[PDB]
Design brief:
This is part of a larger assembly, with chains A (73 residues) and B (781 residues). With 73 residues, chain A is an alpha+beta fold. Chain A has helices at 2-12, 23-26, 30-33, 65-72, and strands at 39-42, 54-58. The longest helix of chain A is centred in the N-terminal third of the chain and has 11 residues, at 2-12. Chain B contains 28 helices and 27 strands. Chain A binds chain B through residues 40-41, 44, 46-47, 50-57, and chain B through 2-3, 6-7, 10, 228, 231-233, 236-237, 239-240, 242-243, 272-274, 276-278, 281. Chain A: It comes from Rotavirus A (strain RVA/Monkey/United States/RRV/1975/G3P5B[3]) (RV-A).
């Protein structure tokens, strides 16, 4: 796909020089992004592979300073 | 598809509280000259009331459309509260450095103070007009300068502004009585609220439309919406017994061939969790939404037939759909019950008025099973109104689960029988299948009590009355999801958190409030259209707006017939007080607004008689008339519906006196030479040739010293006489003092929209959680 091409062209040309501070970089914001996605429907666990889904809705009460963190990143 | 509906529901923001920054105005003062009688002009000028935004169309139908649009505008401005200090401004000429309510009021006061041509009394009055306060009452009194219609609207918005004093008691009283009186919950708050505070109450008036009366396609959507919402608040079954530590107990009870686990000898099919929670959720959400649920089972699986008993007992039968439970009852009777007494198999008929349990209750002679089936057949809901809302309630024996004891009585009897007609393996299979339920007895009792408790607890958080009506579409319920629930359950109580309850209650409140509010909107516009005689208006797009503002329907695929029936129902609803009063302030002043607006005229008189002109003073001499008496009148909108230019043509060819009625443009002519030449009589010949009456523009003969031929009047002793006067009123004269009013308001209150955020709520430890009977639930072991 196109976005795949962008990612690949943007890493292949930069991974030729940077080899110590790249995967640490792009893989870091993800820990915050997961804290921004509202739940509409869920999966549950009971015993090691049990599931029991829930139609529970849950919002995402994210504070403001983590946006500043993400922006710095 | 499913998740989307809840996304739509939970994105219903409440009705945003309104607060205006200025005052409703239609009129404004304006300096015109004044022409002393005989026509000539004073050095002095004078103020008059004129209209802001003269935009009135031609023709009467179009004018009534204009006033309907004005009614919509005034409704959209129609606020919920206001604090006059927030719009107040200084007066640049006040003795006491006072204030006045509006910026435009101040502009008026500061323009009249400057004019040469104002008495000293008005300047004194302007120096002495100021604000006042009385803080013991939190009240303020500001001056204002307002046309009477404008004062009427503003004063109505003052006296009829919707707020209510907020306190710490109303917060509690906003919660249902059941939650407050349910000992499993503990409530508090960390704030005291002053008497300076306020709050607005929702409109929770029940369905004025009876959508459960032959709007089944809409009721299906409503009930589905409430079902899926209720699924989001039923608790998950946090703790169960494991799914493999059960199946080995079942297998040894059944003494099955090894590695039949992957074949699942029909007793053992669909035992998993992900179904027990599904059934627990489906049953409750369906009973809450009152949505019918159909059963998809198999007859090879006898545990499904056995676990259908608990279901058909704890749940009413009018709650299901008929053919499904007919199949299930038939199966139960044919392979668990009648073979246990040597009865014939059965002979059931497809289209039979009676269900198998009815026709079985009378045949067999055993007390236990007979009375169990009696309970099943005559189990049904109990309607009861509580906290205003109708509710479908259970028996009070299902709740404190003892029905299961009658069930055990029947099942134990059937264990004790023999199956003479049938072999030994069959009896063995059935009796083991029901021992697996006998061994779960106490857990079944606990389950029944837990469902009943959670059901009533969530019923508490309902605002719209809950009717018991079958529906087009159903909700499937596989009986393996019952067998699982009846077999995977134990020592694990689940109480809905208070926050889920408050969420569900506020959601339902907001939906109900939106519903009532939009109903009132549509009813207002419909009633207004009917009272303004708007007959060309097709009342569909209004109902489209009504359904769009209800964010669950698809108007793209709903027809016109439902809309018109819905309209027919909406016709018969009373308009709320606000909208009705605002409309009756327009019906009594729409004409007085229409007498103004020097772009149209209310008619033209044609009287072939050298009549006199009138000594007005904003004009000089004019061909104006203000009564329309004497001559007979002809309405033009009648003439433009049914083109019959026979009457009027007869009357024009024969020079007969007449009046023509309807909003007509006009054009001023300040030439005296156009008066003696009699040009105004030249306009009505285009009505006989091209029979249209649209390009009809009578003349107004305003004469004065500013006319360049006025000298004749002042040299020759002739009052301006003329023909074909015009039917029109004069502007009103601006009296500063009489135009002044004092507007009252409250001083510095604070409006709190959300109402439960101040409430903090907690649950007792669910081991020691209790039902209505002051007796613990989940206690059997």
């Amino acid at each position: 796909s196109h976005e795949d091409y962008l990612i690949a062209r943007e890493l292949i040309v930069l991974s030729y020089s940077n080899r110590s501070t790249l995967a640490k970089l792009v893989s870091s914001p993800m820990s915050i992004l997961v804290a921004l996605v509202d739940i509409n429907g869920t999966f549950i666990t009971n015993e090691e592979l049990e599931l029991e889904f829930s139609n529970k809705y849950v919002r995402a009460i994210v504070p403001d300073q983590t946006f500043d963190e993400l922006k710095q990143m | 598809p499913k998740e989307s509906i809840l996304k739509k529901l939970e994105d219903i923001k409440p009705e945003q509280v309104k607060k205006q920054t200025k005052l409703f105005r239609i009129f404004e003062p304006r300096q015109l000259p004044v022409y002393r009688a005989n026509g000539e002009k004073e050095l002095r000028n004078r103020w008059y009331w004129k209209l802001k935004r003269d935009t009135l169309p031609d023709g009467d139908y179009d004018v009534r459309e204009y006033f309907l649009n004005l009614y919509d505008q005034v409704l959209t401005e129609m606020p919920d509260y206001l604090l006059l200090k927030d719009m107040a401004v200084e007066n640049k000429n006040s003795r006491d450095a006072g204030k006045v309510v509006d910026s435009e009021t101040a502009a008026i006061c500061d323009a009249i103070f400057q004019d040469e041509e104002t008495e000293g009394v008005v300047r004194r009055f302007i120096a002495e007009m100021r604000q006042r306060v009385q803080a013991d009452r939190n009240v303020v009194n500001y001056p204002s300068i307002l046309h009477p219609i404008d004062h009427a609207f503003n004063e109505y918005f003052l006296q009829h502004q919707l707020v209510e004093p907020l306190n710490n008691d109303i917060i509690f009283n906003y919660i249902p009585e059941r939650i407050r009186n349910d000992v499993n919950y503990i409530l508090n708050m960390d704030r005291n609220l002053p008497s300076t505070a306020r709050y607005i109450r929702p409109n929770l008036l029940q369905d004025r439309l009876n959508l459960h009366d032959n709007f089944e396609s809409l009721w299906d959507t409503i009930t589905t919406s409430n079902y899926i919402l209720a699924r989001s608040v039923v608790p998950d079954l946090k703790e169960l017994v494991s799914t493999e530590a059960q199946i080995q107990k079942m297998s040894q009870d059944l003494q099955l061939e090894a590695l039949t686990i992957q074949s699942e000898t029909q007793f053992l099919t669909g035992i998993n969790s992900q179904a027990a929670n599904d059934c627990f959720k489906t049953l409750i959400a369906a009973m809450l939404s009152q949505r019918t649920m159909s059963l998809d089972f198999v007859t090879t699986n006898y545990m499904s037939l056995i676990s259908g008993m608990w279901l058909l007992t704890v749940v009413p039968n009018d709650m299901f759909i008929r053919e499904s439970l007919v199949a299930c009852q038939l199966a139960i009777i044919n392979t668990i019950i009648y073979p246990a007494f040597g009865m014939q198999r059965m002979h059931y008929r497809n289209g039979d008025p009676q269900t198998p349990f009815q026709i079985a209750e009378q045949q067999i002679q055993n007390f236990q099973v007979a009375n169990w089936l009696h309970f099943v057949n005559n189990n049904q809901f109990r309607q009861v109104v509580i906290d205003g809302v109708l509710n479908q309630v259970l028996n009070d024996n299902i709740r404190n689960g003892h029905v299961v004891n009658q069930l055990m009585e029947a099942l134990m009897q059937l264990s004790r029988q023999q199956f003479p007609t049938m072999p030994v393996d069959y009896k063995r299979s059935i009796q083991r299948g029901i021992l697996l339920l006998s061994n779960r007895l106490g857990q079944l009792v606990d389950l029944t009590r837990l469902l009943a408790y959670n059901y009533e607890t969530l019923m508490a958080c309902i605002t719209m009355n809950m009717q018991h009506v079958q529906t087009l579409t159903t909700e499937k319920l596989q009986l393996t999801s019952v067998t699982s629930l009846c077999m995977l359950i134990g020592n694990a109580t689940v109480i809905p958190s208070p926050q889920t309850l408050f969420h569900y209650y506020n959601v339902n409140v907001n939906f109900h409030s939106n519903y009532n509010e939009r109903i009132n909107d549509a009813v207002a516009i419909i009633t207004a259209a009917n009272r303004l005689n708007l007959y060309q208006k097709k009342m569909k797009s209004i109902v489209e707006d009504f359904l769009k503002r209800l964010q669950i329907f698809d108007i793209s695929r709903v027809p016109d017939d439902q809309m018109y029936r819905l309209r027919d129902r909406l016709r018969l609803l009373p308009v709320e007080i606000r909208r009705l009063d605002i409309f009756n302030l327009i019906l009594m002043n729409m004409e007085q607004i229409e007498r103004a607006s020097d772009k149209i005229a209310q008619g033209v008189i044609i009287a072939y008689r050298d009549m006199q002109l009138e000594r007005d003073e904003m004009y000089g001499y004019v061909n104006i008339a203000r009564n329309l008496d004497g001559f007979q009148q002809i309405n033009l909108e009648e003439l433009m519906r049914t083109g019959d230019y026979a009457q009027i043509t007869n009357m024009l060819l024969n020079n007969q006196p007449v009046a023509l009625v309807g909003a007509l443009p006009f054009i001023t002519d300040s030439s005296v030479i156009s008066l003696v030449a009699k040009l105004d009589a030249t306009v009505f010949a285009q009505i006989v040739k091209l029979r249209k009456v649209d390009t009809l523009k009578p003349i107004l003969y305003k004469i004065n010293s500013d006319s360049n031929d006025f000298y004749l009047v002042a040299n020759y002793d002739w009052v301006p006489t003329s023909t074909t006067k015009v039917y029109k009123q004069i502007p009103q004269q601006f009296d500063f003092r009489a135009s002044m009013h004092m507007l009252t308001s409250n001083l510095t209150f604070t409006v709190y929209s959300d109402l439960l955020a101040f409430v903090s709520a907690d649950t007792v430890e669910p081991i020691n959680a209790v039902a209505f009977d002051n007796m613990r639930i989940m206690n059997e072991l």
